[PDB]
């Protein structure tokens, strides 16, 4: 017996010594040193200091620059907003709770925190899916005479919200649950304790297939064709050095975007799938946070890849940050 069950939680620590407390009531300093909690707080603090400016400046320059307000950029703003949800929903809260040693906001706060953090990360997730689709449609042109505009673009943004709620809301109403996670300071989906009262086994697979596999495939197809469409058009146009550069620059970005997507969500997949295969073994608190470490940082490196390596967002940002010059 490697854990300690409760009504609305699961502390990954044996209570054979009588020391385990509810993560809503007393600090869990027995499953992690108090400095490990400070380091958690340190890390949360970092993601606020980087995540908030970068994602907020993305929203700010779009207000200052008419040329950023194009339909093919809507999904990118949605992304920055999704990260802001990840910041003020998950990072700020976890910073506060880490400094007490337990999730002081009770199970109610556990559902709020878990909802908005899950909502933020999934809006961002499907935002990447939608963006990949749009680029496939725009570049590869599968539909003759089709034109991508403001109407289609708003559909794309709403689609992420439906997909995200399709993942973040069922745990509020009984198809999974938000419980304290890892060092018990942040709340997430219970993917690792069979809870037939909420049918976690089904939800994990729903998550794994719908939310993970489907995006992984869409993003691989959409970007697969795109490099192909660009490779071919370059070969037929080898007399154009620019068209040869674009092919190389685009191939590079496609690799970065794909790889980044894997780093963000592959860990989570690998761990959850392991727990599903190797059910309910001794998984430590810090073990649980390693998946959690990678997608949370996406709130910083997604805006870097998608906004800051976008040539215009960058120039508008530089001009904005340099008082209107350059």
């Amino acid at each position: 017996m490697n854990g300690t069950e409760g009504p609305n939680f699961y502390v990954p620590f044996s209570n054979k010594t009588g020391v385990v407390r509810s993560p809503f009531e007393a600090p869990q300093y027995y499953l992690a040193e108090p400095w490990q909690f400070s380091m958690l707080a340190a890390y949360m603090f970092l993601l606020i200091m980087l995540g908030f400016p970068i994602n907020f400046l993305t929203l700010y320059v779009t207000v200052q620059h008419k040329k950023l307000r194009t339909p093919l950029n809507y999904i990118l703003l949605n992304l920055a907003v999704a990260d802001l949800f990840m910041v003020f929903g998950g990072f700020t809260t976890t910073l506060y709770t880490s400094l007490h040693g337990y999730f002081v906001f009770g199970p109610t706060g556990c559902n709020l925190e878990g909802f908005f953090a899950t909502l933020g990360g999934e809006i961002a997730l499907w935002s990447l899916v939608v963006l990949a689709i749009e680029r496939y449609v725009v570049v590869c042109k599968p539909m003759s005479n089709f034109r991508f505009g403001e109407n289609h673009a708003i559909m794309g943004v709403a689609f992420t919200w439906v997909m995200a709620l399709a993942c973040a809301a069922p745990p509020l109403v009984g198809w999974s649950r938000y419980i304290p996670e890892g060092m018990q300071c942040s709340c997430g989906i219970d993917y690792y304790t069979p809870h037939e009262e909420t049918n976690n086994e089904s939800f994990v697979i729903y998550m794994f297939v719908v939310h993970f596999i489907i995006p992984l495939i869409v993003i691989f197809f959409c970007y697969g064709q795109l490099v192909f469409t660009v490779k071919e058009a370059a070969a037929q146009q080898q007399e154009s050095a620019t068209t040869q550069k674009a092919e190389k620059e685009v191939t590079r970005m496609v690799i970065i975007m794909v790889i980044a997507f894997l780093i963000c969500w592959l860990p989570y997949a690998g761990v959850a799938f392991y727990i599903f295969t190797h059910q309910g073994s001794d998984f430590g608190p810090i073990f649980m946070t390693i998946p959690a470490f990678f997608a949370k940082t996406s709130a910083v490196y997604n805006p870097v890849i998608y906004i800051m390596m976008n040539k215009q967002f960058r120039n508008c940002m530089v001009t904005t940050l340099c008082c209107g010059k350059n």
Binding site: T70, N73, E249, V254, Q312
Partner: peptide
């Protein structure tokens, strides 16, 4: 493709 590549921000 170039004009379509700039509209999506990939080049």
């Amino acid at each position: 493709i170039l004009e379509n590549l700039k509209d999506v921000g990939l080049f």
